[PDB]
Design a protein around this ligand. Sequence first.
Ligand code: C5P
Lengths: 245, 241
Amino acid sequence: SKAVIVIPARYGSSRLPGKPLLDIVGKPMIQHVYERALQVAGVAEVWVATDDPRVEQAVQAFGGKAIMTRNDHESGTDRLVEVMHKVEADIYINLQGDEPMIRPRDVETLLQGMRDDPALPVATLCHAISAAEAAEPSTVKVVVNTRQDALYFSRSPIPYPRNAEKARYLKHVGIYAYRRDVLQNYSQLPESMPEQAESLEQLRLMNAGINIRTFEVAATGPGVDTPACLEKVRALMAQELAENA
Amino acid sequence: SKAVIVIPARYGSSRLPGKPLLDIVGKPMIQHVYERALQVAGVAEVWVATDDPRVEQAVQAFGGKAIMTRNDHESGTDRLVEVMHKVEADIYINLQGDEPMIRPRDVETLLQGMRDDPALPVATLCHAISAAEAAEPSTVKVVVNTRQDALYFSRSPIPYPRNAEKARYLKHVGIYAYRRDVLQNYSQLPESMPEQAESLEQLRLMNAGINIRTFEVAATGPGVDTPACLEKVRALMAQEL
Ligand SMILES: Nc1ccn([C@@H]2O[C@H](COP(=O)(O)O)[C@@H](O)[C@H]2O)c(=O)n1
């Protein structure tokens, strides 16, 4: 079973132009993600999928593998489908190019899950959050059954807190592992009403009856989207270097 | 493929004690439900499951069939499980004893669905509602996939209206059809965290991975929970004549 990690990294961003190129303790953000991806056991290759030459150059400059993709791509899953045709693997892992604090062990958990169950099409991550955090529409919640399969994903707080003290919330961590056949049949799936309403691409899979197992990990480090969280990551990353001396 | 309709009708109610015996244009509420149930094609028997001798006698008075069940059941579902042991069938339909405006056609849609797919364990109903109505925690919303299987049931407005004009909402109508094997295993299913938090018993099935197909019907009539709804139903069933 061959597994590869693909890191989508488009330059264009409204509140952070050239987001993957921002410096974090001396290296572009995209490099930190790539370096951590390389530490994931069981992965054959790591690639960066981009639609901008500057990103491709920055990646090659540190010796990373870059593959140009179409800029007309609406989603990071469509971009991964294009990569799938050129890069062969049985399992593709999609990592966010803007989460430099990703833990290699979490990707291994995800990979081990896919290998322990040959029938599993998609796998993703989640971690426990408080009810107060779950109230945010910018945070995606997920509810799972006993096998840890996702029942639904939503920006609405689910489960509804009728008996508030009994409610436990899970935040969805946007890292995915897809079997090859899922990506091959992907472009034929129609957009679902819940997907368009919620603006959550993963609901397109659920509409088609494709199971998504969700593994729970510890609270993940802060992503980068706000210049405030950027400074926190910078200090958190720097605090990490001195800790491992 | 033998199907039976079971109507849970406990005497008690915090807002309307003796609810099944309340008069609605000449007949107790339970009789209206029982008569409409008898109009459902494809069913072999209709039973009223109750805990009180007063309800049992009232049903026998109009010629219906009734079975005494334990008074310690927490829900009509548990009451149905007790009945399944006494009344043998392949498919059991659970009708609410407080919804006298039930349309026989809607129960036939549900039954047809179960017969069209022998692999389907549970089926239920739903109908379109507005965004305004979906915002209410007392209204249970359901989201389904292309095969109409339910993804989740919630009091929260699902789907979240990020793009409001794209959102379409469905209200769950508490009528169920269960295959016998689901009921034989029901007592072994543990309660789920989502069930306890939302206070929705059907989430106990989803937690165990049991599929629930949801068929869509037109807007249904109100049930009788409060004395206000009781007066509204009386008014509606009167003009319906
Ligand atoms: N313990 C319980 C609770 C409810 N039920 C039944 O469930 C249906 C709807 O519930 P409520 O009227 O209690 O709200 C009624 O037909 C009622 O008799 C039951 O049979 N046993």
